[PDB]
Amino acid sequence: LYTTYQLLEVQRKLKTLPAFFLQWFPRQINFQEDMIAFDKVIQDVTRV
Amino acid sequence: TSLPNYLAGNGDLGSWEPTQIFAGEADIVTEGGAAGADIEIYQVIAKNAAGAMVPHDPTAT
């Protein structure tokens, strides 16, 4: 006839690409608007 | 202006600056006078012979 078999109980993990650069992008904003305006304010007060 | 932009991109919106005028605590004296030439904003003025308000320029005869 044939040979019987038996499989494994092994689940699948993907390991896609690790979040190495998303450690520098912490904040998340969702928006129903059109565009996102930003600001580029000089934070330094380095003068006597 | 009818079609929205479905794509991605950037847009520069502008750059503000403060324009401070004052450097002291003296009082302020203002007056209105008729102008003779075109005068810009915060421009130094003089008076010509007619009593109008010509913007300031030395080396004149």
XYZ file of all heavy atoms in Angstrom, unseen atoms left out:
842
model
N 0.816 -1.206 0.000
C 0.000 0.000 0.000
C 0.850 1.257 0.000
O 1.246 1.751 -1.056
C -0.948 0.004 1.198
C -2.105 -0.974 1.025
C -2.898 -1.131 2.293
C -3.000 -0.468 -0.078
N 1.145 1.764 1.189
C 1.785 3.062 1.323
C 2.412 3.140 2.705
O 2.285 2.225 3.519
C 0.777 4.188 1.112
C -0.236 4.289 2.222
C -0.112 5.253 3.215
C -1.342 3.459 2.254
C -1.033 5.355 4.223
C -2.261 3.551 3.256
C -2.110 4.503 4.237
O -3.035 4.614 5.244
N 3.064 4.260 2.975
C 3.659 4.527 4.272
C 2.837 5.590 4.968
O 2.559 6.640 4.384
C 5.096 5.004 4.135
O 5.100 6.262 3.449
C 5.913 4.006 3.336
N 2.452 5.323 6.209
C 1.799 6.344 7.007
C 2.802 7.414 7.418
O 4.014 7.191 7.421
C 1.174 5.721 8.246
O 2.207 5.187 9.077
C 0.259 4.599 7.844
N 2.294 8.586 7.772
C 3.165 9.674 8.175
C 2.644 10.290 9.462
O 1.580 9.929 9.966
C 3.253 10.750 7.093
C 3.719 10.270 5.753
C 2.814 10.061 4.731
C 5.059 10.047 5.498
C 3.226 9.635 3.492
C 5.480 9.609 4.262
C 4.561 9.410 3.265
O 4.978 8.978 2.029
N 3.403 11.248 9.980
C 2.936 12.126 11.039
C 3.668 13.451 10.928
O 4.893 13.477 10.789
C 3.140 11.515 12.425
C 2.631 12.427 13.527
C 2.540 11.747 14.865
O 2.797 10.555 14.980
N 2.178 12.504 15.891
N 2.908 14.539 10.977
C 3.438 15.888 10.844
C 4.004 16.386 12.168
O 4.212 15.630 13.120
C 2.351 16.822 10.337
C 2.014 16.678 8.866
C 0.752 17.432 8.533
C 3.161 17.230 8.061
N 4.261 17.684 12.231
C 4.713 18.343 13.441
C 3.694 19.384 13.874
O 2.995 19.970 13.040
C 6.028 19.054 13.237
C 7.228 18.349 12.647
C 8.348 19.344 12.783
C 7.537 17.047 13.321
N 3.637 19.635 15.173
C 2.882 20.768 15.693
C 3.834 21.954 15.754
O 4.369 22.297 16.808
C 2.299 20.445 17.060
C 1.250 19.354 17.038
C 0.711 19.046 18.419
O 1.243 19.603 19.402
O -0.243 18.247 18.524
N 4.068 22.582 14.605
C 4.955 23.736 14.511
C 4.182 24.891 13.900
O 3.712 24.795 12.760
C 6.216 23.436 13.690
C 6.996 24.714 13.439
C 7.088 22.452 14.429
N 4.054 25.979 14.651
C 3.407 27.179 14.153
C 4.389 28.010 13.337
O 5.595 27.755 13.317
C 2.856 28.008 15.305
C 1.741 27.334 16.052
C 1.225 28.183 17.187
O 1.757 29.257 17.464
N 0.179 27.710 17.850
N 3.855 29.028 12.668
C 4.632 29.856 11.758
C 4.836 31.241 12.351
O 3.867 31.934 12.675
C 3.945 29.958 10.399
C 3.939 28.658 9.633
C 3.252 28.818 8.297
N 1.817 29.020 8.442
C 1.013 29.352 7.441
N 1.507 29.536 6.225
N -0.282 29.516 7.656
N 6.097 31.631 12.495
C 6.483 32.993 12.819
C 7.154 33.594 11.596
O 7.779 32.876 10.810
C 7.427 33.032 14.022
N 7.024 34.907 11.423
C 7.430 35.486 10.151
C 8.839 36.074 10.169
O 9.623 35.795 9.255
C 6.418 36.542 9.718
C 5.039 35.968 9.417
C 4.124 37.088 9.009
C 5.104 34.907 8.339
N 9.159 36.885 11.186
C 10.445 37.580 11.335
C 10.726 38.471 10.121
O 11.620 38.223 9.311
C 11.592 36.592 11.597
N 9.910 39.519 10.012
C 9.788 40.258 8.756
C 10.974 41.186 8.504
O 11.813 40.916 7.642
C 8.496 41.069 8.799
O 8.665 42.155 9.713
C 7.398 40.198 9.338
N 11.085 42.255 9.286
C 12.209 43.165 9.287
C 12.093 43.779 10.667
O 11.001 44.235 11.035
C 12.225 44.269 8.229
C 12.559 43.978 6.769
C 12.461 45.248 5.954
C 13.944 43.396 6.665
N 13.165 43.797 11.445
C 13.064 44.324 12.805
C 13.034 45.840 12.806
O 13.624 46.496 11.943
C 14.323 43.786 13.483
C 15.280 43.635 12.376
C 14.500 43.249 11.164
N 12.342 46.395 13.798
C 12.106 47.833 13.889
C 13.346 48.537 14.432
O 13.388 49.018 15.565
C 10.888 48.114 14.754
N 14.373 48.611 13.589
C 15.583 49.288 14.027
C 15.505 50.788 13.829
O 16.033 51.541 14.650
C 16.813 48.735 13.318
C 18.066 49.481 13.647
C 18.546 49.504 14.939
C 18.762 50.152 12.665
C 19.686 50.201 15.249
C 19.913 50.837 12.968
C 20.374 50.860 14.262
N 14.855 51.251 12.774
C 14.749 52.687 12.605
C 13.515 53.274 13.256
O 13.483 54.481 13.501
C 14.773 53.048 11.129
C 16.096 52.823 10.485
C 16.322 51.702 9.716
C 17.120 53.734 10.650
C 17.545 51.493 9.120
C 18.343 53.528 10.055
C 18.556 52.407 9.292
N 12.523 52.460 13.589
C 11.349 52.985 14.271
C 11.573 53.223 15.758
O 10.629 53.610 16.451
C 10.154 52.056 14.083
C 9.638 51.932 12.656
C 8.449 51.001 12.619
C 9.277 53.279 12.089
N 12.781 52.998 16.270
C 13.104 53.433 17.619
C 13.331 54.931 17.684
O 13.333 55.500 18.780
C 14.352 52.715 18.129
C 15.617 53.173 17.451
C 16.830 52.417 17.903
O 16.746 51.538 18.756
N 17.979 52.757 17.336
N 13.525 55.576 16.539
C 13.764 57.004 16.466
C 12.522 57.775 16.071
O 12.555 59.007 16.064
C 14.895 57.278 15.477
C 16.174 56.763 15.994
C 16.497 56.557 17.299
C 17.264 56.255 15.229
N 17.751 56.015 17.398
C 18.241 55.811 16.137
C 17.520 56.153 13.863
C 19.452 55.278 15.726
C 18.715 55.621 13.459
C 19.673 55.195 14.386
N 11.430 57.079 15.756
C 10.159 57.689 15.379
C 9.116 57.237 16.394
O 8.343 56.307 16.129
C 9.751 57.279 13.966
C 10.661 57.784 12.890
C 10.754 57.114 11.696
C 11.446 58.896 13.079
C 11.594 57.561 10.706
C 12.287 59.341 12.089
C 12.361 58.668 10.904
N 9.068 57.851 17.564
C 8.171 57.341 18.603
C 6.721 57.770 18.448
O 5.814 57.005 18.783
C 8.784 57.906 19.888
C 9.425 59.160 19.457
C 9.909 58.953 18.060
N 6.478 58.972 17.940
C 5.145 59.551 17.974
C 4.325 59.136 16.760
O 4.848 58.989 15.654
C 5.231 61.071 18.034
C 5.846 61.602 19.296
C 5.896 63.106 19.255
N 4.553 63.644 19.074
C 3.677 63.814 20.058
N 3.998 63.480 21.301
N 2.475 64.309 19.800
N 3.022 58.973 16.977
C 2.095 58.568 15.929
C 0.914 59.518 15.894
O 0.302 59.782 16.932
C 1.594 57.146 16.151
C 0.647 56.679 15.077
C 0.217 55.255 15.275
O 0.599 54.615 16.249
N -0.586 54.744 14.353
N 0.585 60.021 14.707
C -0.557 60.909 14.520
C -1.375 60.441 13.327
O -0.845 60.309 12.218
C -0.127 62.374 14.347
C 0.317 62.940 15.690
C -1.250 63.213 13.807
C 0.922 64.295 15.612
N -2.657 60.180 13.560
C -3.622 59.910 12.511
C -4.416 61.174 12.238
O -4.698 61.951 13.151
C -4.558 58.789 12.935
C -3.820 57.518 13.233
O -2.883 57.161 12.532
N -4.222 56.832 14.293
N -4.773 61.389 10.978
C -5.351 62.672 10.614
C -6.266 62.507 9.410
O -5.896 61.875 8.419
C -4.243 63.704 10.352
C -3.441 63.456 9.111
C -3.643 64.228 7.991
C -2.450 62.499 9.079
C -2.899 64.025 6.850
C -1.723 62.270 7.930
C -1.937 63.046 6.825
N -7.476 63.045 9.521
C -8.416 63.061 8.414
C -8.269 64.294 7.551
O -9.066 64.488 6.632
C -9.854 62.986 8.917
C -10.245 61.679 9.533
C -11.695 61.673 9.930
O -12.397 62.664 9.749
N -12.156 60.561 10.478
N -7.275 65.129 7.819
C -7.111 66.373 7.086
C -6.425 66.081 5.756
O -6.276 64.931 5.338
C -6.319 67.375 7.916
C -6.897 67.631 9.291
C -8.251 68.294 9.257
O -8.504 69.107 8.347
O -9.070 68.000 10.149
N -5.990 67.127 5.068
C -5.277 66.923 3.818
C -3.776 66.805 4.055
O -3.168 65.788 3.719
C -5.592 68.061 2.846
C -7.038 68.046 2.387
O -7.620 66.946 2.293
O -7.599 69.133 2.133
N -3.172 67.831 4.638
C -1.734 67.886 4.823
C -1.428 68.018 6.309
O -2.322 68.247 7.123
C -1.141 69.063 4.040
C -1.525 69.039 2.569
S -0.922 70.405 1.565
C 0.784 69.932 1.347
N -0.158 67.869 6.675
C 0.279 68.080 8.050
C 1.273 69.222 8.072
O 2.348 69.120 7.476
C 0.920 66.839 8.674
C -0.094 65.725 8.835
C 1.489 67.179 10.032
C 0.530 64.500 9.425
N 0.943 70.280 8.794
C 1.860 71.389 8.956
C 2.778 71.127 10.136
O 2.346 70.617 11.172
C 1.098 72.696 9.159
N 4.047 71.474 9.969
C 5.059 71.363 11.006
C 5.633 72.734 11.325
O 5.336 73.730 10.664
C 6.194 70.431 10.581
C 5.827 68.992 10.580
C 5.382 68.383 9.433
C 5.929 68.244 11.729
C 5.049 67.051 9.436
C 5.606 66.909 11.726
C 5.156 66.320 10.590
N 6.492 72.761 12.339
C 7.165 73.971 12.777
C 8.647 73.676 12.946
O 9.031 72.552 13.275
C 6.575 74.468 14.087
C 5.125 74.879 13.951
O 4.744 75.392 12.883
O 4.353 74.668 14.907
N 9.480 74.683 12.706
C 10.933 74.529 12.756
C 11.550 75.571 13.673
O 12.490 76.281 13.309
C 11.558 74.630 11.373
C 11.051 73.620 10.377
C 11.441 72.209 10.758
C 10.970 71.235 9.697
N 11.249 69.829 10.064
N 11.014 75.675 14.885
C 11.399 76.742 15.797
C 12.783 76.474 16.364
O 13.108 75.346 16.756
C 10.346 76.849 16.908
C 10.664 77.981 17.860
C 9.001 77.031 16.287
N 13.618 77.510 16.387
C 14.927 77.408 17.018
C 14.740 77.350 18.526
O 14.245 78.300 19.141
C 15.816 78.588 16.623
C 16.054 78.592 15.116
C 17.129 78.516 17.360
C 16.704 79.856 14.615
N 15.134 76.235 19.130
C 14.952 76.069 20.564
C 16.088 76.657 21.388
O 15.922 76.828 22.597
C 14.798 74.592 20.903
C 13.505 73.984 20.420
C 13.395 72.526 20.787
O 14.340 71.935 21.302
N 12.233 71.939 20.540
N 17.219 76.985 20.769
C 18.409 77.372 21.518
C 18.295 78.777 22.084
O 17.960 79.724 21.369
C 19.640 77.300 20.624
C 20.010 75.893 20.267
O 19.730 74.988 21.077
O 20.582 75.694 19.176
N 18.593 78.913 23.367
C 18.848 80.208 23.988
C 20.273 80.119 24.515
O 20.512 79.678 25.640
C 17.858 80.533 25.106
C 18.120 81.924 25.646
C 16.440 80.405 24.608
N 21.241 80.509 23.697
C 22.647 80.313 24.016
C 23.398 81.632 24.020
O 24.511 81.735 23.502
C 23.301 79.339 23.039
O 23.162 79.835 21.703
C 22.669 77.966 23.135
N 22.814 82.656 24.624
C 23.416 83.975 24.588
C 23.275 84.648 25.942
O 22.228 84.564 26.585
C 22.790 84.803 23.465
C 23.390 86.167 23.244
C 23.098 86.608 21.832
N 23.509 87.977 21.568
C 22.660 88.996 21.561
N 21.375 88.770 21.763
N 23.085 90.224 21.311
N 24.355 85.302 26.364
C 24.433 85.917 27.679
C 23.492 87.109 27.755
O 23.405 87.913 26.819
C 25.888 86.327 27.952
C 26.032 87.029 29.279
C 26.776 85.119 27.902
N -9.024 75.201 -9.931
C -8.894 74.437 -8.698
C -10.068 73.494 -8.535
O -11.075 73.857 -7.941
C -8.829 75.348 -7.477
O -10.060 76.068 -7.371
C -7.693 76.335 -7.617
N -9.947 72.291 -9.089
C -11.046 71.342 -9.039
C -10.622 69.958 -8.569
O -11.405 69.253 -7.928
C -11.692 71.244 -10.416
O -10.781 70.714 -11.355
N -9.406 69.558 -8.877
C -9.022 68.179 -8.605
C -8.075 68.113 -7.425
O -7.070 68.835 -7.409
C -8.353 67.555 -9.824
C -9.245 67.295 -11.029
C -8.422 66.845 -12.211
C -10.270 66.247 -10.665
N -8.344 67.271 -6.434
C -7.415 67.139 -5.314
C -6.187 66.350 -5.725
O -6.177 65.641 -6.732
C -8.233 66.389 -4.263
C -9.179 65.583 -5.068
C -9.516 66.396 -6.283
N -5.131 66.490 -4.930
C -3.888 65.767 -5.163
C -3.947 64.458 -4.393
O -3.843 64.450 -3.164
C -2.683 66.597 -4.733
C -2.462 67.790 -5.621
O -2.594 67.700 -6.838
N -2.128 68.922 -5.019
N -4.118 63.354 -5.109
C -4.120 62.059 -4.453
C -2.726 61.568 -4.094
O -2.611 60.594 -3.346
C -4.807 61.014 -5.326
C -6.300 61.179 -5.422
C -6.896 61.627 -6.585
C -7.117 60.843 -4.355
C -8.260 61.763 -6.673
C -8.477 60.979 -4.433
C -9.044 61.437 -5.591
O -10.411 61.566 -5.660
N -1.672 62.216 -4.580
C -0.331 61.690 -4.404
C 0.268 62.183 -3.094
O -0.385 62.831 -2.277
C 0.592 62.094 -5.548
C 0.350 61.554 -6.952
C -0.586 62.481 -7.687
C 1.637 61.379 -7.706
N 1.541 61.878 -2.905
C 2.312 62.396 -1.790
C 3.231 63.499 -2.283
O 3.552 63.578 -3.471
C 3.131 61.292 -1.131
N 3.649 64.356 -1.362
C 4.568 65.419 -1.717
C 4.736 66.363 -0.553
O 4.115 66.201 0.501
N 5.586 67.358 -0.755
C 5.822 68.374 0.252
C 5.356 69.736 -0.234
O 5.241 69.983 -1.436
C 7.297 68.445 0.649
C 8.218 68.651 -0.532
O 7.795 68.658 -1.687
N 9.491 68.855 -0.244
N 5.085 70.618 0.717
C 4.730 71.976 0.379
C 5.258 72.956 1.398
O 4.961 72.841 2.589
N 6.046 73.923 0.944
C 6.538 74.976 1.816
C 5.466 76.042 1.998
O 4.930 76.577 1.024
C 7.837 75.572 1.272
C 7.764 75.914 -0.206
O 6.764 75.565 -0.867
O 8.724 76.532 -0.712
N 5.142 76.332 3.253
C 4.044 77.226 3.570
C 4.504 78.638 3.885
O 3.710 79.573 3.747
C 3.235 76.648 4.737
C 1.901 77.228 5.198
C 1.011 76.108 5.651
C 2.096 78.181 6.355
N 5.755 78.824 4.287
C 6.253 80.165 4.504
C 7.112 80.321 5.738
O 7.267 79.383 6.524
N 7.667 81.515 5.920
C 8.594 81.794 7.010
C 8.261 83.158 7.588
O 8.482 84.182 6.937
C 10.037 81.759 6.521
O 10.272 82.807 5.600
N 7.732 83.168 8.801
C 7.442 84.406 9.500
C 8.698 84.933 10.177
O 9.611 84.178 10.504
C 6.347 84.170 10.535
C 5.953 85.371 11.281
C 5.335 86.464 10.787
C 6.173 85.623 12.665
N 5.137 87.386 11.777
C 5.647 86.889 12.944
C 6.758 84.894 13.698
C 5.687 87.448 14.212
C 6.795 85.450 14.958
C 6.260 86.712 15.204
N 8.759 86.247 10.340
C 9.769 86.908 11.144
C 9.090 87.995 11.955
O 8.158 88.642 11.466
C 10.869 87.544 10.286
C 11.746 86.566 9.560
C 12.768 87.264 8.696
O 12.681 88.502 8.562
O 13.661 86.580 8.155
N 9.511 88.210 13.192
C 9.053 89.398 13.903
C 9.783 90.604 13.362
O 10.926 90.512 12.914
C 9.443 89.122 15.356
C 9.701 87.662 15.411
C 10.248 87.304 14.075
N 9.105 91.745 13.386
C 9.711 93.009 12.983
C 9.543 93.941 14.171
O 8.533 94.638 14.297
C 9.084 93.562 11.726
O 9.168 92.579 10.690
C 9.831 94.802 11.274
N 10.515 93.912 15.069
C 10.504 94.822 16.195
C 10.933 96.198 15.733
O 11.832 96.341 14.902
C 11.424 94.333 17.306
C 10.925 93.110 18.000
C 11.816 92.703 19.136
O 12.840 93.331 19.389
N 11.443 91.635 19.826
N 10.276 97.212 16.273
C 10.494 98.585 15.874
C 11.203 99.368 16.964
O 12.051 100.213 16.677
C 9.145 99.237 15.537
C 8.355 98.321 14.633
C 9.345 100.526 14.803
C 6.915 98.624 14.689
N 10.878 99.087 18.213
C 11.251 99.942 19.319
C 12.517 99.433 19.979
O 12.772 98.230 20.036
C 10.118 100.002 20.333
C 8.859 100.544 19.766
C 7.867 99.690 19.343
C 8.676 101.903 19.627
C 6.703 100.180 18.805
C 7.513 102.400 19.093
C 6.526 101.536 18.683
N 13.316 100.369 20.464
C 14.520 100.039 21.194
C 14.609 100.762 22.523
O 15.619 100.617 23.217
C 15.765 100.365 20.360
N 13.594 101.531 22.897
C 13.652 102.267 24.140
C 12.300 102.465 24.776
O 11.331 101.786 24.428
N 12.221 103.397 25.721
C 11.007 103.606 26.494
C 10.520 105.045 26.417
O 9.778 105.489 27.296
C 11.229 103.210 27.951
C 11.609 101.766 28.131
C 11.704 101.370 29.582
O 11.541 102.254 30.447
O 11.953 100.176 29.851
N 10.928 105.785 25.395
C 10.468 107.153 25.262
C 9.013 107.181 24.819
O 8.447 106.173 24.392
C 11.327 107.915 24.261
N 8.404 108.351 24.920
C 7.031 108.459 24.475
C 6.968 108.536 22.953
O 7.977 108.709 22.270
C 6.352 109.662 25.124
C 7.122 110.949 24.929
O 8.236 110.919 24.365
O 6.612 112.005 25.356
N 5.757 108.404 22.426
C 5.520 108.256 20.996
C 4.683 109.430 20.514
O 3.642 109.740 21.099
C 4.825 106.919 20.703
C 5.752 105.770 21.071
C 4.397 106.840 19.267
C 5.079 104.439 21.103
N 5.143 110.089 19.457
C 4.462 111.236 18.875
C 4.153 110.926 17.421
O 5.059 110.620 16.642
C 5.318 112.505 18.994
C 4.700 113.632 18.199
C 5.461 112.899 20.445
N 2.881 110.997 17.052
C 2.454 110.685 15.697
C 1.684 111.848 15.099
O 1.060 112.626 15.821
C 1.569 109.458 15.668
O 0.406 109.707 16.463
C 2.299 108.255 16.220
N 1.720 111.949 13.777
C 1.047 113.014 13.057
C 0.732 112.504 11.661
O 1.434 111.641 11.136
C 1.913 114.284 12.988
C 1.208 115.523 12.433
C 2.116 116.720 12.311
O 3.306 116.593 12.660
O 1.647 117.789 11.869
N -0.346 113.013 11.076
C -0.690 112.715 9.699
C -0.344 113.878 8.785
O -0.561 115.037 9.129
N 0.201 113.551 7.626
C 0.522 114.561 6.634
C 0.415 113.983 5.244
O 0.661 112.793 5.029
N 0.063 114.839 4.290
C -0.151 114.395 2.921
C 1.168 114.052 2.246
O 2.164 114.755 2.412
C -0.872 115.476 2.125
N 1.163 112.977 1.467
C 2.368 112.489 0.815
C 2.450 112.975 -0.623
O 1.444 113.286 -1.260
C 2.427 110.963 0.840
N 3.676 113.026 -1.132
C 3.916 113.531 -2.466
C 4.470 112.477 -3.395
O 4.200 112.495 -4.597
N 5.252 111.560 -2.852
C 5.707 110.383 -3.570
C 5.155 109.146 -2.878
O 4.501 109.230 -1.840
C 7.234 110.336 -3.643
N 5.413 107.988 -3.467
C 4.989 106.747 -2.844
C 5.887 106.426 -1.660
O 7.112 106.530 -1.744
C 5.021 105.609 -3.851
C 4.515 104.320 -3.267
O 3.291 104.201 -3.068
O 5.343 103.429 -2.995
N 5.271 106.037 -0.548
C 5.980 105.807 0.703
C 5.741 104.375 1.150
O 4.592 103.937 1.258
C 5.534 106.805 1.784
C 5.937 108.216 1.380
C 6.133 106.466 3.117
C 5.413 109.258 2.294
N 6.826 103.660 1.430
C 6.756 102.285 1.902
C 6.440 102.261 3.393
O 6.057 103.265 3.996
C 8.058 101.552 1.607
C 8.334 101.332 0.139
C 9.628 100.588 -0.090
O 10.354 100.352 0.897
O 9.922 100.238 -1.252
N 6.601 101.104 4.010
C 6.247 100.904 5.406
C 7.520 101.012 6.226
O 8.520 100.355 5.907
C 5.579 99.540 5.608
C 4.542 99.314 4.518
C 4.863 99.517 6.924
C 4.049 97.890 4.427
N 7.473 101.826 7.280
C 8.611 102.183 8.131
C 9.765 102.738 7.300
O 10.875 102.215 7.285
C 9.058 101.003 8.991
C 7.954 100.501 9.861
C 7.284 99.340 9.545
C 7.569 101.193 10.992
C 6.259 98.873 10.327
C 6.541 100.740 11.780
C 5.886 99.579 11.439
O 4.854 99.110 12.216
N 9.467 103.817 6.594
C 10.410 104.492 5.726
C 10.634 105.899 6.255
O 9.717 106.525 6.786
C 9.880 104.544 4.294
C 10.864 105.036 3.253
C 10.277 105.000 1.863
O 9.100 104.696 1.684
N 11.097 105.296 0.866
N 11.858 106.390 6.114
C 12.225 107.687 6.666
C 11.789 108.776 5.698
O 12.087 108.714 4.502
C 13.731 107.747 6.929
C 14.101 109.054 7.559
C 14.144 106.612 7.815
N 11.086 109.784 6.213
C 10.444 110.779 5.374
C 11.103 112.125 5.637
O 11.763 112.331 6.655
C 8.939 110.873 5.664
C 8.369 109.523 6.029
C 8.190 111.219 4.411
C 7.012 109.671 6.604
N 10.915 113.052 4.702
C 11.232 114.455 4.924
C 10.085 115.305 4.409
O 9.032 114.774 4.054
C 12.532 114.833 4.228
N 10.273 116.617 4.360
C 9.294 117.514 3.765
C 9.958 118.324 2.668
O 11.002 118.939 2.897
C 8.684 118.453 4.802
C 7.720 117.792 5.745
C 7.235 118.743 6.817
C 6.326 119.799 6.234
N 5.753 120.667 7.299
N 9.348 118.340 1.490
C 9.860 119.142 0.391
C 9.415 120.593 0.554
O 8.903 120.999 1.600
C 9.425 118.548 -0.942
C 7.931 118.351 -1.037
O 7.187 118.637 -0.103
N 7.479 117.878 -2.188
N 9.598 121.391 -0.500
C 9.272 122.811 -0.418
C 7.772 123.048 -0.349
O 7.332 124.066 0.195
C 9.867 123.555 -1.612
N 6.973 122.121 -0.868
C 5.530 122.303 -0.884
C 4.864 121.916 0.426
O 3.654 122.112 0.566
C 4.911 121.494 -2.024
N 5.609 121.381 1.385
C 5.006 120.886 2.600
C 4.469 119.475 2.518
O 3.765 119.045 3.439
N 4.772 118.738 1.451
C 4.379 117.343 1.338
C 5.352 116.455 2.112
O 6.160 116.924 2.914
C 4.305 116.927 -0.127
N 5.271 115.148 1.882
C 6.079 114.169 2.606
C 6.841 113.306 1.606
O 6.366 112.249 1.196
C 5.211 113.321 3.502
C 4.508 114.086 4.591
S 5.642 114.870 5.731
C 6.269 113.459 6.624
N 8.028 113.757 1.224
C 8.918 113.026 0.326
C 9.800 112.133 1.187
O 10.263 112.588 2.240
C 9.749 114.009 -0.515
C 10.774 113.301 -1.383
C 8.838 114.853 -1.367
N 10.045 110.874 0.817
C 10.968 110.048 1.601
C 12.393 110.559 1.534
O 12.817 111.163 0.547
C 10.847 108.667 0.955
C 10.349 108.930 -0.395
C 9.432 110.101 -0.269
N 13.129 110.292 2.608
C 14.380 110.979 2.882
C 15.483 110.588 1.916
O 15.683 109.407 1.624
C 14.831 110.676 4.301
C 16.185 111.209 4.619
N 16.437 112.554 4.770
C 17.367 110.581 4.813
C 17.716 112.731 5.045
N 18.302 111.549 5.079
N 16.208 111.595 1.429
C 17.370 111.362 0.583
C 18.320 112.553 0.658
O 17.964 113.658 0.234
C 16.944 111.117 -0.862
C 18.030 110.460 -1.685
O 19.125 110.198 -1.146
O 17.786 110.187 -2.877
N 19.537 112.369 1.179
C 20.528 113.451 1.140
C 21.096 113.703 -0.244
O 20.685 113.066 -1.220
C 21.622 112.953 2.092
C 20.943 111.993 2.973
C 19.930 111.314 2.120
N 22.072 114.615 -0.308
C 22.709 115.102 -1.538
C 21.673 115.617 -2.536
O 21.487 115.073 -3.625
C 23.608 114.039 -2.182
O 22.812 112.946 -2.654
C 24.609 113.522 -1.175
N 20.986 116.681 -2.137
C 19.975 117.310 -2.968
C 20.237 118.808 -3.054
O 20.738 119.421 -2.109
C 18.573 117.047 -2.424
N 19.894 119.387 -4.199
C 20.170 120.795 -4.457
C 18.903 121.643 -4.462
O 18.923 122.795 -4.895
C 20.882 120.984 -5.798
O 20.013 120.576 -6.862
C 22.145 120.141 -5.841
